[PDB]
Each structure stands twice: as C-alpha cells, then as structure tokens.
Symmetry: C2
Subunit: 594 residues, 2 copies
Amino acid sequence: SLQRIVRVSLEHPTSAVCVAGVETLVDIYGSVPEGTEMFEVYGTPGVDIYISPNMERGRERADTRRWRFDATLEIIVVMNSPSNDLNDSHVQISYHSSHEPLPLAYAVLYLTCVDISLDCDLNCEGRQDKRQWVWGPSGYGGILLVNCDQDLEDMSVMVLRTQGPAALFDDHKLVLHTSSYDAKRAQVFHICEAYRHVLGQDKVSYEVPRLHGDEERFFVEGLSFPDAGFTGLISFHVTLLDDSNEDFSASPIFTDTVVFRVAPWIMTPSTLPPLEVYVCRVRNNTCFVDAVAELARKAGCKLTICIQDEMELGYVQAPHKTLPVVFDSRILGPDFGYVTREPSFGNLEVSPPVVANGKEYPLGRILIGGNLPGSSGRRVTQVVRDFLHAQKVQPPVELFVDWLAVGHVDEFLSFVPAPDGKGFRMLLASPGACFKLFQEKQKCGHGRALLFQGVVDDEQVKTISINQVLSNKDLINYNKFVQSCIDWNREVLKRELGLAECDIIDIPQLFKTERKKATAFFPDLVNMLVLGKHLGIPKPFGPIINGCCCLEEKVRSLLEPLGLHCTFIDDFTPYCGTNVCRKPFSFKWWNMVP
Amino acid sequence: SLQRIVRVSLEHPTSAVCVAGVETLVDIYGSVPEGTEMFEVYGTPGVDIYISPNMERGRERADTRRWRFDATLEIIVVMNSPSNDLNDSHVQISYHSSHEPLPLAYAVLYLTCVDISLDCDLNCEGRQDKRQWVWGPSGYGGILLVNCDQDLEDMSVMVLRTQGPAALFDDHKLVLHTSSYDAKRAQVFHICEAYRHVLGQDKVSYEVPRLHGDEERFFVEGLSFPDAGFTGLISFHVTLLDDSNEDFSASPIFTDTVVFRVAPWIMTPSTLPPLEVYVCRVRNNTCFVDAVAELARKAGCKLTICIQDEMELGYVQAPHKTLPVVFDSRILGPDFGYVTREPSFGNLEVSPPVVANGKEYPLGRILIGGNLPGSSGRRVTQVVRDFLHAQKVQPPVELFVDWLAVGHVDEFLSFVPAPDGKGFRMLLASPGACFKLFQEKQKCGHGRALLFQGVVDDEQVKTISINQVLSNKDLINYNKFVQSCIDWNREVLKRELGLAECDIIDIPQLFKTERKKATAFFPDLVNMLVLGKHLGIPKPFGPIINGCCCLEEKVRSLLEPLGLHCTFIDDFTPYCGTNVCRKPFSFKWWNMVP
C-alpha cells in the first residue's frame, strides 16, 4: 504494498499522519522553484527516506547526497515506530541551483506515526499475506464457529492495535464497519453486561472509543451456516478517518481488514472412532438395550435416554475447539450445537475419505437418498440439500431408494473398518449372495434347514426351509429385482467413490414386498451399528445347520478376517431408533482445496 | 465411463435395454452350475463382448475362445448401434466342464439398444467431456441469454436424440426434469402456440411424447441474471425409466445432463469503439446537440431522443449473438434487453482490460463510487453491487466520491485510447496541474489573463485573472484538499488496475465549494465523451493568452500527441445527460478463468 500520496507546499508547512510501515510518497502541490536543478531530502531519525524512479521498483536512501532534479523521481517516506507526541518528526525537502549557494525554497512536512492493525488468528500452514481467505495446505483465514442455526467460550476474538498519540484521536475517528449482508449473518461484541453489542444486525458501523489503551478487544459470533445464498465468508474493516477540515469533508487515511469463514458442518462416518451412542428408551426391549450396552462397553461409553433417524449428528471445528452439532428436521445441550432448516428422510448418510476421478475427498462424501424423477413426492431433497451443498466440504451423491417401503440409505448400505486396501469396506445388501448361499447349502443336503428356528424355537412363528425359499419363484424374482435396484446404487457408489470390487462385500439379504416396495424378508443384516472394530448386527434368524445360523456363519466368514467382531443383537425377536456421536477426522477441513 | 450391471439367470432368459455406447456388465444372479471350470460368451454381430479382470482396467474380446472360469472376471457388453426391433440381439453365456462335452447350462440375455442423448451446443475451444461447465480457453458449456430481468430468436435450443424401437416406449418413459431452484430461473418450451411450455416455474418434470420421430427439439430461456443467490448455472436432465414391472416399482436405466450458464452482464469501457450515442432532448441547448452531432459524424452514428446517468448500458453475449442490455435504477427496445434490481448513483463506471497483482482482468473492472464508512447515507451500494459481483466477470473496486457535491466517478476520471503503453491512458482531474500551469503562465508575465473571457466576451459574467486565482488563499487550499482526495483514488486505481505513473495524465481542473463539497470551478474538462479517437470535452473558458484558451492548449499538448482530436464543446455556455452504446470486446467472457 500500500502507498499513499501526501502533498507539500513551498508556501507553508504541511501536517500529515503516517500509518506504521505504509509507504507515504511525497510530491509537491504546484510548481517547483525557478531555476531548480537539484534537491535534497532530510528527516528526523525515525523517518526512513527513499527515492525511486516512478518506472522502476527499487528504492534508494535519499538523505545522504544531493540529487539532480528529475520530476520522474519519487520520494518515499516510511515510519515503522509510532509517535510519542503529535508532529514529533518531520521531512524537509530543499531545492537547489548551482548558481545560488542557498536553498531556493523549503518544503516541510511534519508527521505523526500511528500503528493501526485489525487482527484475528488464522493458521501457520503457510504463514507470512493479503486479507482474503485462502483454502489449502498453504492458506490462511479466520474461523467462526456457529452455535445455533459463558455466553460463548466458543467465540472468536478480534483485536484492534492502536499505538500512537492519544490527542491524535480528538481529531481523527476509528470506524469499525462491515457489510449489511455480513452483518445479518454475524455479530460483534466490544469488551466495554460488560461486553457491548457494537456490530450487529441493524448495526453496520461503530466509532471506537479507545477506552482500553493500546489494544481494543472484540468477540465475533457467526449466526448462520453457509446456505444457498451464503458462502460462509464474513469481512470486517477498520478505517481511520480525518475530520479536522471542519469546512471541508471527512477523508480516509487507512483501512484494514480481517476475513472470517464460517466453519462448515461435517458428517461423521461410521468408520470414525465412537464417543457416545444415542439410544431411545424402550420399556419393551430390555434385552436389546442390554446388548447395546455390552457392545458400547466393548468399545466405549454409551448413554441412554427417552427419534434417532429424526436428526443427524455432525461437528464443526476451529483450531481452538471442535463442537458437536445436531442437524434437525429438546437437546442434550452441554457441549452441543443445533442447526435447523425450515421450508423428511433425515436418516444417516455419509461415506469415508475417498479419491475419485482425480478429485480428492478427504472428509468423505454425503450420500443423499434421492427420489426418482417425475415423482409427485419428494423424500430427502426438501431443498435442505441447499444447505448440504453449501457446506462445500462433502460433495453429495444422489442414490436410488424409491424401491424401499421405508427408503433409508442404511437399509442396504454400510461402511466398516478394514485393516488393508483403502482402510474400509463397503457392505451392500445382496439378494444373490443369499441366493448363492442357499443353493450351496442345498447341494450339500441341508435344503431342509429351517429359517426362523431360533425365533420359532418356542413361539411358533411360520418357519421356512431353504428348499421352500429357493422354489418360491415369486420371491426369487422379486429379490432379483431388488438386487438390480441395489446394483444401480453399487455402480453409482463405485464411480463417485472410486471404489473397486475388491473393496466391496456383498452381504446375503432377502426381501419381500410391502405395498409393492421392498422390506426385509429376514432382519436386515447390513443395518449395522459400527463402533470401531465391534459390530451390532441384527441377528438374522436364518437356517440352523449343525446348530448354527448359517447366515451368521457367513457374515463371520466375511467380516472376522478383517479383525471385526460380530455380535448378533436381537432387534426383531420381541414382536425408537439408534444413533451415535463420533470423534472428528484427523484431517482438518480448512486444508481441503475444493 | 458409465457402467451398468445386468444380471442373468440360468433358469430362464433375461431381457434388457442397452443404451448406445454404455458398458453393460453381465453377472449371474445366484450360483454357477456344479463342477463349472470354463465358460464361453457369444453375441449377435452388433454386440461387442469383452472380458476384464475386475482389478485391472483393460478389456479383451471374449467371444473367440474358451476361458478358465474365474469369478474375478467381468463380462462387458456394448452396443453402439440402435436396435431396429425389440430384442433383435442377444448374448449367450455357456458354462463348461472338462468331463462333460456339452454346456452345463446356458444364460441368455436378449437386448434392445436405444440411443438417448440430451444435447446443446457449447464450444470448440477444447472440444472432445463431463457434463459440467468449464471456464477457460480449454473449457465448455451451454450459454443462456437473458432478455428481461419471434418471442425469442435469441433463444437457446435443446435437442433430445432418441433412436430405437418405437414399441420400447409403450413400456418405458422419458422424463425431462430440472431442479426447483433451476426451474425458478429458467423455462423450456417443447416444439409440440405450437411451442408448448413444458418445463417452467411450477413445472419440474415432463414425460416426453416422442411426437416427432428421432429427435425432440426444445428451446430454453433464462429468466434471471446471476444474483447474490444465483451462480448462473442451470442443469437439465433426461431419464429413461423402466415401468414394466407392474407389480414391482419403476427403476432408472439411464440419465443424461446438459449444463447451461447464464451469460453475465458486461459493462462497455469508453475505450471500446462506439456504435450509437444517447442524447436527451434539450429545447434550450441547440448548439450543444449540433456539436455532439458533428462529433458523432466525426466517428459514427448518433441518435437523439427526449436520464442518461439514470441507467447504464452493457451487453450479454453468446456464440450466436450479442445483445445490448440496459441496467436500470420506456425503452428503445428493438434489439435491446433490460435488467432491473429493486430494493441512486447510477452513473458510468468501468475500466479497460488490465493486469494486476498477477490476476488478469481481460474485460476490465467496474469502478464503484463508494460511500465513506460510518455514513448515514448510502450512495451506490444499495446492494445491487450484489448483482455486479455476482456477474463475476468484472470484479469491482470501491472509490472515494463522498467529497463531491454530485459524486459521479466521471467527474474526475476518464479512460482514453492510447497508441502505445497499455493502449489507453487514465485521465485524472488534477488541481495542481492547473496550479502548476497558472504559475508557469504567471512567471511568463501573463498573470493578467482573464478566465471566462470567451463566456464573458459579450455577457459580463464575473471574469477572474490568473493572478487573482493564484492569490486567493482559500481557493488554493480547498483545491489542495480535493487534489488529495483525488490522490487517494489515484493510488487505489494504480493498485487494482496495475497502472504506472507513465500511464496516467493529470488534467488541469479547479474546484470550488457547494455546501462544503466539491464542484467544478470551471467546466469539468475530464467529463469527456470518448468516441474512438474523437473527444467531446467541455470547453473550459480558461485564461485567454494570445487569443487562445491556455487550458485548451494544455489539454491539446497532452492529448493530440496520442492521436486524439480535441473538440471543445460548449456545455456550460447557456446559463439532461449523455450516454453511448459500444461494440463489445473482441475477448469472449467464457474464455476468462476467475
């Protein structure tokens, strides 16, 4: 870089304000004396004086010798140290002729150095520039955590450094201002019950008292997540204004900016480590809550309370803290946030970190269960997907779920830790894996094995044999249909998540029809609970061969090789929902480069 | 890239639809015969059959020999040519054992190839990819021209290519769909009084009749420019849906997309060639309209009509046509468009093509006359700047105009053609250039020269001499103030427009005070009309030395060297506005890479 032109007169002295480190360039207002041929420049000790050709970029110290007068030359004055008193430094230019021993004329410029800096804390990824927000491993910006759609220890502090003569500000004003747009989505408090609401919704500008010496503290709070019309960027400026020309108008001296970005909302994948599990109270299903308790104690801690698929759990994060957030449509509350968008799929849908089509998704991708084109009803896209695309960090992919009676993505999809490959496996429900399994068992002579023999060990509940299933032509054809439905999604996922067949495990799962749409013929295996290396799998109640549920043995043969532990939980045995909280990524969202 | 999984059965044949060029991959539903060791694949002539390892990327033709059975292998079937009739082609897989001479079992898949393509016209900059919108010299997208905030020859045509058996579409449906968001800002007509409004504001989906044979034409019209909440992108999709499983649900086969971008609004710089000039009728100022007519005939054509600064003139452009557009707050109309944003500076403000801070601005930058921080009033930023930033193509810079009574950017700023350097010069009003000039004339003995001697040659209107001006201390100090005001803007422009001093010309201009704010002491020279190499300059009525307005002679000495022709027009002599239309850039906006 920033430069500034201050113009001096031969007739009388000039008075000016230097901002610490900014280059003031000094020109003359009007003409230079008669017969001028040379000039000298001189300054008090703290004033750095340079010359430069106005074409070339370099600078040279000027106070040491006498220069041939060239209009093309530039005088540049900088002051790095604030002034103690007004006009305690000065610059003198003298013009000279070879004939006349003495200066033709003097031009004197008294200066007052003030240091003004508006600042936050960004990051040291590529420390050192402009006031904008740089994504990436070599970028920088301020972060704002949004709490809601003491009061805030999760607040973002803003500091104004003002060093210089006190009296300077009898005459000069410090404005803190923002945009109307930026004001609607953020608010600032000045420290200065004690914290005073200076910049806010109607409030756009604010004269700074300078009630607290050298530095003036502020606390910023972001009120809105990035929406369809909001990029998540908030700028604040400070401006030094000159209001000494009582007859003239007020004029700007200097401006500084700080740019904040609102932290996006990030979904947690069922491959992240678990922290706490939300289970909704069941007077009826004691044993199931016991089993989930045992699982949690197998992995971590588990809280229970009087739905789960009604809301989603994610997090926001800044360098200082990460904050759990809940997306909805009343709360836990302590150490929690809330996001609500009002205009109902709501279910759990996010992938692990992946690489696809050259692009890289370090935080994974959000899987939105779509609604088939040309359909009267809308299922998930209730243009909150607005909000999810606006997050920018987990680009979503649409999936095909219209064929299910319920229509949840987790009904046929699961992501599980893997010790090799890409570190995870994708589990897909597969009627056809079950078909193959039943045929293999049939050819071994176990065609008479009875599904639902554990369920109907004591309460007769319509058992079926492998043979009866395999020869029910209608059931087989319907399951071929839903297998093809799942195939479509499989190929979509394989594309958008750059997955290979070797990364995918087909889980034997049958289906039947409720109102011409898919439901689970036997408990949906893939509707897992994934807590690190421990799995809460709906016990299938499949055919008992040699006193074992061959379905369970299959799932084990598939998953135990990967170090997983399969605990088959009795979800369907007795005639609310399930959800969990997870620790964030090791990866930091601001290091992504969309 | 796209792939698709079609599953076949040993029990009975399978029927499927191939989209032309898409890879169908063929697997078996359930298990493979007993003792299977080998397999062969075969197809009718138009069916290309390949094998691939599911790990590796290559493909190999498969119909020529007998393969060792490996579950890891992939069968891939493609059909590049549409089918004449249903199921007129097929694929047969046979499984084999070394012991048994004959195929253990067959799996047969009858196919119907249909070619479905949704298409527009993008560009041949880097022809050849994905359906998205690529900026740059090696990019592509569809363009939509917005006419308003026969019916349209400036319409964007959309084509659906459907080749294949007619009967196929008794059973299968073609949906044309868009987003609700995209629907609000665009509408489509199907040809198909004759053109039928199929996709529109409430309309999101549309079954395609196929009333017109192989290809179905559509005409798209963009209704909204890119705003704060609109990026200018509009996507349309076609989807082939299978609705033959009357008992099951409908399922997707294939989807295609075409992406349009709304063309931004581009301001025309006063260095572009002129086309037509808008002059508002003046019963009083005959001679001035005569003079502007003479200027236009010096350069081009000029129309006159019964303000100019009330609106702005720009253009939108697509590969087929460019359309003049007028931004407002009734019209010319034929070959014209209109943009209006409702919630008043309105004046003329745009720079020429420039390079700054590494970034490149091929179409120039928009100069927004800002309002000083913390001021009750808003002058230009009435959050239509929303709209101007949203255009994305001419990033705007804020300037300081609060010191003027009127406050127009053109009051002190002008861009003029230059034959060298950067091809243009920036002209700035400069009290100080005038100061220097008056001093030089004073030292030559012409201190008695009378300003306003032409104006007051016959009507005595308070003439001033050079000497009287120079010694009016108050006037000089005020003009030093406004010179510093202009200095600030000069440095801003020099930064944001990467300009050098050698690119700037200071034009001698004095000022006086109207209600503590700047107005022209003598007619504002820099408030030019720039028509190619011809200039309509307010005649200054400056001091007559040797029967010449020394101000005019100065302006000539500055501008004539650059090939310019200065015609001093009598704007202020007798006791509405001015505007012009310009030919677009040679540069094309879609070749910029913001």
